[PDB]
């Protein structure tokens, strides 16, 4: 998370260099000119990638990120009234914008949750964003 395309190019080059560097047993000092064996018979494995991700590459990202969430409605069951209310306040002004125009009811612009700390507030707020395919 936070990597950009150039950072991922750097990740690929460093993982390939780590796969070279583990093969110094054949890439020796006695063979200054490297034979054509390891030039085409070296494949990178997964822990090299995990090393290159872990040991290096700080991400150059600190600002916000826009995306669709991947949490689902059954991730937090129950609260059918709240689900019905959020469907009425989010889904219907975007899925059916003409019926809101038949008799002129304007949509509302926001709710205010309140409750005890840590009862899945953000995990409830992302669910309707995922369901509407909304950022």
């Amino acid at each position: 998370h936070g990597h950009v395309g150039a950072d991922l190019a750097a990740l690929c080059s460093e993982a390939a260099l780590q796969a070279i560097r583990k093969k110094m047993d054949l890439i020796d000092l006695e063979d200054e000119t490297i034979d054509a064996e390891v030039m085409n018979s070296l494949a990178v494995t997964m822990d090299d990638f995990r090393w290159a991700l872990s040991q290096s590459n700080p991400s150059a990202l600190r600002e916000t990120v826009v995306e669709v969430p991947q949490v689902t409605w059954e991730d937090i069951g129950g609260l059918e009234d709240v689900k019905r209310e959020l469907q009425e306040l989010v889904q219907y002004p975007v899925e059916h914008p003409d019926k809101f125009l038949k008799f002129g009811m304007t949509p509302s612009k926001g709710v205010l949750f309140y409750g005890p700390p840590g009862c899945g507030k953000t995990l409830l707020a992302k669910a309707i964003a995922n369901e509407c395919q909304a950022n």
Binding site: E88, Y92, H96, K99, F100, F103, G104, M105, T106
Partner: protein, 103 residues
């Protein structure tokens, strides 16, 4: 008019809310009525409603009869007395009262 003299102490910003709550309560049923009509089991071309049935063409009576149940007056009696008392802080044409010019 029957809705007029029932709401007695309601502010002007409170009864403008129930004519959107009734619209929301009718838009819910007009969305819901379209769910079963497309989710007809064995949706066959036989006996098909070629005309739009329009179950909720307009806001009916029981929408207001149900939307009224969530009504609440915003201003109390204790704060309208604050404005009555400030109206009394203006002297309000009080004092000597009627007098007449001599003849």
């Amino acid at each position: 008019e029957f809705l007029a003299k029932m709401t007695n102490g309601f502010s002007g910003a409170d009864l403008t809310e129930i004519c959107q709550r009734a619209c929301k309560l009718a838009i819910r049923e007009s969305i819901e009525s379209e769910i079963r009509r497309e989710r007809e089991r064995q949706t066959n071309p036989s006996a098909m409603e070629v005309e739009e049935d329009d179950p909720v063409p307009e806001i009916r009576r029981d929408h207001f009869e149900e939307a009224m149940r969530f009504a609440r007056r915003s201003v109390s009696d204790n704060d309208i007395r604050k404005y009555e008392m400030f109206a009394q802080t203006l002297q309000q044409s009080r004092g000597f009262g009627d007098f007449r010019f001599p003849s």
